[model samples]
Target chain A: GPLGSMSQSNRELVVDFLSYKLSQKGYSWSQMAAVKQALREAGDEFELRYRRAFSDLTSQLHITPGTAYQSFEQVVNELFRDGVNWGRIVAFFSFGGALCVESVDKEMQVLVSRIAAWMATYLNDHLEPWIQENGGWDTFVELYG
Target chain B: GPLGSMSQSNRELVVDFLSYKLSQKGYSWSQMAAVKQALREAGDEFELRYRRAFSDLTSQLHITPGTAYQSFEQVVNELFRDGVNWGRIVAFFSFGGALCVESVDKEMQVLVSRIAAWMATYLNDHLEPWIQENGGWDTFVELYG
Candidate 1:
């Protein structure tokens, strides 16, 4: 049988485990704050750089309860078909954030969590192996920090 | 022009920077020791599982001074042609270590450092982007720790 996608609970467990490991390594609160700040700036930069394309993408998306996950997968796969790089990755996260915002605007608050879950599963199943090979978050911090 | 290969000195600088960042994150001495132990164990396991192939590979290798880098690239490329996976990556590291040992045994000690340089260059130029996409060293620790 095909393996099931990671459940939200399983993803939380993985996140918690990783957090504990980082703490053991001395990832202090201050360090985490700085990392988050870097990430926010990267997200902002990505949005600014691709504002037109992003607007066009969101406008074209016709996500609904029946087609949300399928739509998400289709668009993301196309975004990444050329190849995955840090820039494209940031764009991915930014796209998810946009989807969440759009969901909230349309009073479809339930879809926000769904979008987050889909993104997390996609990351774990697809992007994770590549990230592990490169150097992980540390390299991201190095490049964008 | 295509970018020149990373100089050995540049690789050392990048290593130093990463080490400093990791230290900032609370990567303590004991943690480092544990990580090294895990890596050694992975290498040992790879060797045991691929003993026959490893032996045949070393026996067939004829790394002369002039052809050393080309030979390294060819073999590593072939090893990874099918795909890059954690197991194959471990095998790659194990192969490098074996080559160093063989060089020392044959009194071709100068080639040891050269081989290391070649491996580092190939990693940065070829393998790094893929690795980064996967999840980096932390994921490796999680999987094999």
Candidate 2:
């Protein structure tokens, strides 16, 4: 497994949940701002150089070349390597859904499905525990909404 | 002609103006909401749907099919066949620019150019006078900003 203990079935469940939420909400400016800023990552000399990474990761996982993932375990691991910031984690997933809409607009159904898989995987392995402790999906939605 | 005495050159000029304004301001939620709702047109048995008209007119002009124009005289004339409301005219061009962004995301650059041409035309023939009477583009920007 690219990410250990990350069961494929669990990833599928996460993907389905994200797909449901997205079809219900559509796209919004709030999500784009969050995603762009997350990529910006508080400047970090942070050139926001993720397109190549996005291209690379999606292909590795069998999604469209330019598709954005809701979560990538490697990214999550790196982001937390320094430390954990719940706000930043929330920012991460918020942008993921928005990117999904961009794909739908472009008619990349195959890629959309695959990206959601990773999103759910990352969420279950990392975000869900913190989300459950904090107040659950509703709280996460509000911050990211 | 819906826009009497308006020339293609002038139409081109109006589009350039709109293009400049949009590039300067970027996109916002308020503008998209205003545009989409305006298309809903107060639920007027409203035979002239913007989406279809946009589709029809863009393909006709060779900008990009079914795309809403920045300012199009023929479509504008038809939209106001019964009469015209200045506000909706304003809303029409506003959405066109937003649509332009969406097209660029999808890599439809030629359509972007065509929409811009008509957008400017509509602005010169129709929206500009109303804008001047109402305090120019600044007032228009503020209303939707």
Candidate 3:
């Protein structure tokens, strides 16, 4: 439901934007392939559920998927709209960086995986803030789950 | 420890990267307050651990905290030790762009924060693949932790 059912023309554009958006967040096509595969395996019911939830989530944000800040930069900017203060910006950036990725790449992932145990920890440090700020899982979870 | 208790030098680097990287990701100096607030509350232990891991990780990637990758083109061209194959380069670039913020900005904190999250998920994806590739974290646990 990242991009709801669309015509072939729109699908390509959606894929383009989807790939672009995911890449901005460091997603490989292969990684996305798996995600799409998983969703397909989950079935049409799953697709319907995903669309409803994602749509509602966008509505909650007062934006549709095609809308919003229009990129990851816009996403970050919206997340911190309380005037232009550098100290808070820098601190969060560093802290989140450390809290999230350690040495990154393959070797670094192994090192951190010893403690991370699940994707949830990583998700929290990155996407959770937005989820929480937007209004907790209840606001968005029921639709998809 | 994120920088092994964070030396003044490392601290400054993180700060500088946050300030510089956020902008590169298209987030502005004015848009990082939440990140700052999160860090101030995230505590010293969290800070040190994160720094230590990131330092080691980035070092392995041969990146310094304050370094800026001007574009996906710039990053991929340099990443391949030997000339990167065009297809692989395109793939990696596509993945990397997924990590880019949708907009461009004038500060680094937003860039850093936005990118760090992208890397975190990428790290997660890499970890899972290795888990299967190596028959689950057996070797990983011994060397990583």
Candidate 4:
């Protein structure tokens, strides 16, 4: 039940990467704390708002041991089909978290890491450019923190 | 400065894996907390006791951008060449931490993830069997925590 919106490994990767980037820009510990808190709030709000839809989507995806990554990519692609926005990005993270919880609940805990890896890969490959263009986590913190 | 004994990524991986294992065995949050604290102390003590040795070894390794992994493996293999024990295992983690800090100092941040991945692979392939044979982290917490 301690499974937050994302697996612990993905969460650590995100925290490590963001902390590195922020330190490069001379951001302080307080700024990093604010950023982390803001992201957690965003994830919590996303999950709260889409509780039923998330459950339904998990069921419809029929994620199993072998097909977890495929289902994740398919749905995430659909989620971003319209275009990338801050809201969608937050939703994307929430989606990953939901999948992790579902995997753990079903006792397929191995999928947790796979899902985390896929999320990190997707972030680096697809969403990173948009995030940079939109002024990155600093801007996210400014607006949402 | 906050690099610690290992990179944050590798530390998170260990915490995630151990927490998962301990939870499956019905360990409580207090136990997890103790285990983490004990690990931090072990790492800190290892660094303190071998500070000069670690620094000399890092310098001798000639860990530039291209040759970090090879150097790490060479040194780690030498460390475990004699045998494996609790002290050696702690030394192994401290060694990784030292490498991560040195990499960051040289501005070769990309190597951090590679190092983390290498450490994880080594744990799974080599150390995990020994850990399991020795009663795992539960026994570890009992002995160290």
Q: Rank the candidates by TM-score, best first.
A: 4, 1, 2, 3
- What is the per-candidate TM-score for chain B? 0.71, 0.40, 0.26, 0.68
Q: Estimate the TM-score for candidate 2.
A: 0.27
TM-score of each: 0.39, 0.27, 0.20, 0.44
lDDT of 3 by residue, B52-95 (tens): 33222222232334545433234443444454332332233233
lDDT of 2: 0.41
Give lDDT: candidate 1, residue A43.
Answer: 70
Residues A21-134, model 4: lDDT tens digits: 334344432344455546666766766775456434554565666775566677778778889998888776666666666676677767666766767667666776787689
DockQ of each: 0.01, 0.01, 0.04, 0.05
* Cα error of candidate 4 at position B68, Å: 25
The second chain of candidate 3 has a TM-score of 0.26
lDDT of 3 by residue, A44-68 (tens): 3433343333222111222222432
Pairs clashing within candidate 2 = A43-A46, B14-B120, B15-B120, B54-B66, B55-B66, B63-B111, B70-B119, B71-B118, B71-B119
Is candidate 2 or 3 superior in lDDT? 2
| Per-residue lDDT over B1-145 for candidate 4, one digit per residue giving the tens place of the 0 to 100 score | 2223223333333234334333434443234444554555676776677555643555557565577555667767776788777777777666666666667677776676676666655655566567667876568777766
TM-score of chain A of each: 0.71, 0.40, 0.22, 0.70
Better of 2 and 4 by lDDT: 4
Error of 2 at A54 (Å): 31
Residue-level lDDT tens digits of model 2 in B1-145: 1322223322322222222222323422223223332333322222234333443333333335674544356655664566545556534543454445455556674464455555555545555455456764345345443
Clash number for candidate 2: 9
| Interface RMSD for each of the candidates | 16.7, 24.7, 17.8, 12.8
- Cα deviation of B2, candidate 3, in Å: 41
